[PDB]
Structures are given as C-alpha cells and as structure tokens.
C-alpha cells in the first residue's frame, strides 16, 4: 500500500495518473509541468493509489471538491 510519487509545489502534492498531480491546498495539475514526474510511476513495478476517499468512476478525492482517477478529474461536491 503506497501513494504514488510526490509532485508539484515543494513535492506537496501527489500523483493520481501519468499526467495528474493533485494537492490538498494545491488543487489538480492535469498535464502541466508539475505532473511531469508522474510519468515515472509507469516504470515502478509496485502498484500505487493516491487519495483516500473514493468517489466517481474508480476515483479518489484528489483535492478540495475534486475527484480524480489515473486519467481524469471531475468536480464532486462530496470531496
């Protein structure tokens, strides 16, 4: 059980997908420079999952009011 590689502003956020980096007080970076290091997960053998509270289609609450899976992010009031 591990969250995926850290990313973004001072490694505060964490990876939810190859191109998704989200943080508690950060929000979500979808395909921005902050998400570049998230590609590295594709190389690690061990399976990871970030977030804690599940929502939507196999997603986890990535940031405030944001639910993300490994390829998308959506607004879910329950996050």
């Amino acid at each position: 059980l591990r969250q995926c590689l850290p990313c973004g502003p001072g490694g505060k956020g964490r990876c939810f997908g190859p191109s998704i980096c989200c943080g508690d007080e950060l929000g979500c970076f979808v395909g921005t420079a902050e998400a570049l290091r998230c590609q590295e997960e594709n190389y690690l053998p061990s399976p990871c999952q970030s977030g804690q509270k599940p929502c939507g289609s196999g997603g986890r609450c990535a940031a405030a009011g944001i639910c993300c899976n490994d390829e998308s992010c959506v607004t879910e009031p329950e996050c």
């Binding site: 997960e41 399976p47 990871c48 899976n69 490994d70």
Partner: peptide, 6 residues
C-alpha cells in the same frame, strides 16, 4: 505503476 495500469 498506477493501479489500473499495472
């Protein structure tokens, strides 16, 4: 690797 990608 991301769970559903592994």
């Amino acid at each position: 690797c991301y769970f559903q990608n592994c």
